[PDB]
Amino acid sequence: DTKEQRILRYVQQHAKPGDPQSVLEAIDTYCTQKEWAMNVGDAKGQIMDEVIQEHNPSLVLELGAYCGYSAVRMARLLSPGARLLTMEKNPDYAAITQQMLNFAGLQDKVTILIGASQDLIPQLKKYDVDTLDLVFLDHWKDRYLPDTILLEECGLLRKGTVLLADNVIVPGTPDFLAYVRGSSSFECTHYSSYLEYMKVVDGLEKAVYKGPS
Ligand SMILES: Nc1ncnc2c1ncn2[C@@H]1O[C@H](CSCC[C@H](N)C(=O)O)[C@@H](O)[C@H]1O
Numbered sequence: 073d074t075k076e077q078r079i080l081r082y083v084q085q086h087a088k089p090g091d092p093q094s095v096l097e098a099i100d101t102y103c104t105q106k107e108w109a110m111n112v113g114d115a116k117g118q119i120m121d122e123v124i125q126e127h128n129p130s131l132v133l134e135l136g137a138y139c140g141y142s143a144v145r146m147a148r149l150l151s152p153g154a155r156l157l158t159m160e161k162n163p164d165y166a167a168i169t170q171q172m173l174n175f176a177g178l179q180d181k182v183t184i185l186i187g188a189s190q191d192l193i194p195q196l197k198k199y200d201v202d203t204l205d206l207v208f209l210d211h212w213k214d215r216y217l218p219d220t221i222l223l224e225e226c227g228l229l230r231k232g233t234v235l236l237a238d239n240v241i242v243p244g245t246p247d248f249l250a251y252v253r254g255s256s257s258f259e260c261t262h263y264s265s266y267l268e269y270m271k272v273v274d275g276l277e278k279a280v281y282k283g284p285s
């Protein structure tokens with residue numbers, strides 16, 4: 073029994089099926105009252121809502137699904153015929169995200185691609201993608217810069233394609249920011265958002281010296 077399964081169970085018990093906004097409320101409620109989880113949250117979610125509405129994407133790519141909160145958030149605003157692709161390297165998370173999408177009624181608009189972004193992005197052309205309208209970066213932070221460049225190299229960006237990256241301050245993605253800001257090929261805007269709490273996995277390494285080689 074994992075934290076992600078508990079989140080899913082809570083949504084299924086409490087949210088109104090077929091109601092994406094109800095699902096978002098349930099996840100937000102559970103993760104502010106019972107167990108914190110790394111969803112993007114409602115405050116950031118409102119920023120994402122405005123970006124989607126302002127830029128009117130038909131094909132969205134999400135890097136990092138986890139439990140599907142941001143996938144539900146974005147997919148519920150898409151016009152008929154529009155589609156969301158979300159890449160998730162953790163197959164347990166992908167399985168949870170699918171259940172979340174089913175309960176929200178959005179499975180017709182979202183396709184989960186299981187795998188690492190650095191492996192799946194060079195295949196997107198094979199997946200019948202020409203270019204993307206909007207990309208949401210919310211996976212491992214050391215992938216922001218390489219994946220952005222990878223999207224360029226693979227010809228998946230068009231003039232006007234929007235990149236929206238989360239957590240560029242906390243924990244921070246300074247190399248990615250230096251690239252897109254400094255580069256004339258990217259016009260950048262920053263949106264601040266206050267966080268009450270965030271927990272990320274970290275660790276220490278102990279290394280005992282055993283003598284030269
Ligand atoms: N290289 C990679 N390719 C695809 N997914 C990745 C990845 N590196 C990390 N991930 C996944 O990205 C997720 C980050 S948490 C993302 C939360 C989600 N965007 C939301 O707001 O609801 C994790 O589930 C992790 O398994």
Ligand SMILES: [Ca+2]
Nearest residue numbers: 112210238239
């Ligand atoms: Ca995030």
